[PDB]
Each structure stands twice: as C-alpha cells, then as structure tokens.
Amino acid sequence: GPLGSMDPDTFSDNFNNRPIASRRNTVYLCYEVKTKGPSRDAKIFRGQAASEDKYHPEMRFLSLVSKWRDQEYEVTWYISWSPCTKCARDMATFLQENTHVTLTIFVARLYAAADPDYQEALRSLAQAGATIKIMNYDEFQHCWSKFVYSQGAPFQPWDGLDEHSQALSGRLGEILRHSMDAATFTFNFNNEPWVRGRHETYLCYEVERMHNDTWVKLAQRRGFLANQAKHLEGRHAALCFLDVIPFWKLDLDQDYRVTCFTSWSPCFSCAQEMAKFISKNKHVSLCIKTARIYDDKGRAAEGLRTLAEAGAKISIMTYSEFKHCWDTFVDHQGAPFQPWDGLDEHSQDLSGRLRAILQNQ
Template identity: 30%
Template sequence: MNPPDPECITDQLWNRGGGGVAVGKCISLKLALKYSLWLPRVESVTSDRADIRDKELGFFLDIAPIPIVILHDPQRRVSKETRRCLKKQTTDHVCRGITDGGKILQETFIDSYDPSVLRRVQYMLYKIKWSNSKRPWQSCCHSTRMEHAEIHFIEDVFQEQRSDPSVHCSITWYMSWSPCGDCCKQIRDFLKEQPNVNLIIYVARIYWHKEEINRQGLRSLMNVGVSIRVMDLPVYSYCWRTFVDDEDKYEDDYWPRHFAPWIMLYSLELQSILQNTPSCLEISTDENQTPIFSLCVEDDQQKRALTSANP
C-alpha cells in the first residue's frame, strides 16, 4: 500500500475531531517510527507538542531531522510559514542540499555519499543522454517522506525531459542508497515501457542488504540489462567534478581515499546479491550508534564466488 497524499491524511485526521498542531518526537512509538511503519489502528500518539487520538485512521509517520507537522492547523498554533516549509519538505525532491541550478552542495554530497555512515535521506545524481543531442542533461534530487528518488525520476524528471520515444536514451544514476525492492519493480516496468532506454546505476550503499525483497529486486534489474555497480574512487571524483556546487570548491577539498574499505565491503555484498549467494556483510552499531562493518564468509564456495568481485 502506498502512503496517501499528505493533504488527505491531515484532512481525514482533523475532520474526525482533531484540534492540535504538530507531531514532534513520538516517544511511545519510537521503535515503530524508526522503521517508518504503517500504523493502521492508532489509539494515541503522544509527543512533546501534541496528543492526537484516532481509533480507525491509518496514517504514515516518519521520524526525521525535523518534526512532522500536521499541515491543517485550525487553531493556528503553527505559523503559516512553518506549515508551508514543512509541506515543501514532504513533497519537494530538490529542497534539501540542492541549489537552484541543480547542483548538490559540497557538505551534502560529502555527508550523504560517505559509505561509512548510514544517512537517512536518499540522494540521486543523474545524467540523461539522448542519441540525437550532443549535451547530456545533468541534475540531482532526493527522496521525500512520501516517495523515493527513483520514482520521482521515472514519473516526473524523465517525462519532462523526454523527446522522441524512438530516440535511444542512456541514463546514469549515482545514488547514495540502492533501490529498494518495490522501486526495482517500478524501474523494471519503466524499462519495459521504454525499450530504447539504457540504465546504469552506481550506488554508495546497499539499502537493507539482508532483506530478500531488496536482494531479489537488484537481481531482477540485472536480469533485464541494468548495470549495477558500487561507486569506486574514480566515480566519486567524477561526481565531485560534475554535480557538486562550484562555489568555493577546490579539488583538494575532497579526497575520498578513506572510503576504500567500505567500497570493498559493499562491492563484495553486491556481488553476493547478484550471484544469489548468502550475505557476507554484517552491519551493527556500538553504544554510540556508530556503524560497525564486518565481512563474514561462511564457506569456501562463497569465498570462491566472491573472488570475482574484484572491487
């Protein structure tokens, strides 16, 4: 089930007798919200800023760096400007860390594409090259609470840039997270409808790499001709030169050499996924919630299968 439109959520919620204002840190549902779960029957959601009760309404909650604001606020306890900004961050794919010229900010790129940390927001840098055009179209976008970046690209970006459907088109994505299983299905459907499109995907990390639906999704993309690779050092340098905002930028500002161990680990894990062998990457956290990565190879057969990864 897809999340409903945010306006629909708030209208239903408040028309059932709501008052109130914003959902901030929902303590009683902290674990559930961590995984962005649907909550089909909610008796009470209590935060430090609101108490909302509804016995039947299912709605989507998501913990994020900023509070989730109920956009419809009849008592005006949240300013109009705040509601407007928060609504924008719910639906706008280019509002965080992206310039008006379609470039990603330096600090956003460095933070979001560092494979040694697990950032929440998914960014996509993309290049579209039509065979009848000399110059490619290059820009970037990010996920929102309602939609992953891949779906935004398929349903909005590509349709806006599309020319003659008979003309061959080459698309390259540079993604901070690999597509999830559901997005993989929609990507396959998109490619089936667009036989003249060729897609290459580079990823900094693999999204929930042990979930079988995500592993199957990546294999299914490979089976329809999509090239999926982990970003290596030359790719990071290319993205830095091509997609990062030029203001005050110097080549010495960015040197991702320390990414090499994580590039190797994710490359081995991607290889295990595409070869349909058991996962070899373990990710845990220490007491400070710092990610800890380790390589776990079960037997000689898996070891032999992984030697072809050659990250």
C-alpha cells in the same frame, strides 16, 4: 475579526512549517509595499488575502507599484506556500518588465514535489532579481504582529520551528543553487558498507542520447533529488526520479542512456518499480551506480537481480564516480574532491559483494 485580517486559527493553519502535508491548496499571501529610499520612518503599506482563483484578491498589491514619476517600490511577501510554477514565471516576467519594482519573498513551506519545471521557474524568478528565503522565528513573529488580529496575544512558536526552518532552507538552497551542499554530499555518499544516520537518500542523474556512434550528454537534463520522508506519505528517491523521467519528453524512436548515482542502492520495492519501468520504456538504458548497498532487511539482493534481469546495469561507485558527482552536482566553488579514508577499499569490497549478489550467491 475585522475585514482584511486573519485570526489566530488561520495563521496557525497557513503560516506553520510542521508536517501538515498540504491538501487544502490554500495559499495565504501577506504583502508589504514601501517606497524605495533613505527614509527610516517610511510608511509600510500592508495587505493580505487568501488565494482565490475567481477574483484573485492576493494580487491587488500590483496596482500599488505602478509607474509613478521617479518612484521605485520594494515589495515583501510572506506566503504560506512557495509560489506555484506559473505564478513564479509571471512574477519573473513582471520583475523583468518593471525594473522600478524589487521583491523579497519569505516562504513558510515548499511544495514537496520540486519537479524540474517548478525548479526552473523558481531559478528564473531568482535570476529576475527576486529574493527568496524561508521564514524563521523573526518572520513568523513579524507576520503575527502585523497581519493577525490577536487581541493582545503574543506570538507563540511551535516546538520544531527552527529545525523545520533549517531543513526547508537547505532544500531551497538545493533548488536555487542547482547544487547540493558539500557537507551533505560528503556525508550521504560515504561508502562505508554499514553506517548510522543515513536516513535520507540522494540521487544524482544524467542523461545521454545516442548520436552517430557517440553518447552525447544532455546537460540541460542533469540534476539531483532526495527522498521524501516524515509521517503525508514518504516516497523513496528512486520513485521520485521515475516521476521526474516523463517531464523530459524523450523521443520514443531515439536511444537514451540514463545514469543514476545513488547513496543507497534501491530497496526491493523500488527495484521492482524501476524494472517494470524499464521493461515498458525500451528507448532507455538504465545505469545504477551506488555508493552503498542497502540490504533492505535481506530483500535487496533479489531486487537487484530482478532489476539486472530487466536490463539495468548495476555497479558500485568508485573514486572516479564520487569525484564526478562532486564536480557536477556539489557547490564546491572550485574546491577539489577530497576522498574519505578507505574509499577505495570500501568500493572494491562492495564491488565483490555486488558481484556475489548478481551471480546469485
């Protein structure tokens, strides 16, 4: 097509929320810029470019929003991938230094590795005033209508568009709120021994340092994550937490206690991975408190025994732990933790079964 446009194939490649993994680090940015004001017939100034690290044609919109008399500017992005950590930091700085510019960002996909520094950069960009949302049907259709040379072809949505948009919206909310949804928590941490539909695994985590004779909490370091799925390799939540750990830059000469609240107790493979990790990280004492014992087709008891042998403290979550994670990691907005029926009974039964497991029976 014409210069400065994308063809249907480039759109289908970049602006799509199906499990396309990632791989080709192509980040396509469509941008609109409008003069802020009451005009309803205002002229929208549009541009678009794929990310290229030599000349960066995607940032040419910045020249459009320089200070000019009393003018203010509203910028809109339709970006194929969430902005990287450094670009998010830079745009936060820019919004701070250019209060005459405001910015909305619609995103097609989120990077699966929502690691701590990236999440803090995204929350930084949000606090600077940016509006970040996941693209749904309206945004995809608008981007097709405005930035694609289609030759009379109407926008054709793919099958699982809305479901993927909703899942990405939930993840983005988990990131920006720094807390998980109340329905999500209430469901994933239900401690009935045998359950259906718990396809995900949620892992909350806290860190403490030994100062004087006291475990002091490092509130700057608490957090939560979930597993990665789809079939693009599925990485369990325990492995993702192990990946989070090195970002903390712990002092190898200090003593730390690391607590994991998991909805599913670790599978055999994850248990061996965490045993190997703690046997090579002497400065870290691992506590594992699980809502449910994931039997892992009968391989889990051996893994839990291995992990306990390596020094980890494996326990079953009680009402106190559920209430604690509700207060600490759930967007409750003041609401108290409302326990489900049979919580205590399921908890004490699971404690008995874990006891039988650890003593080898």
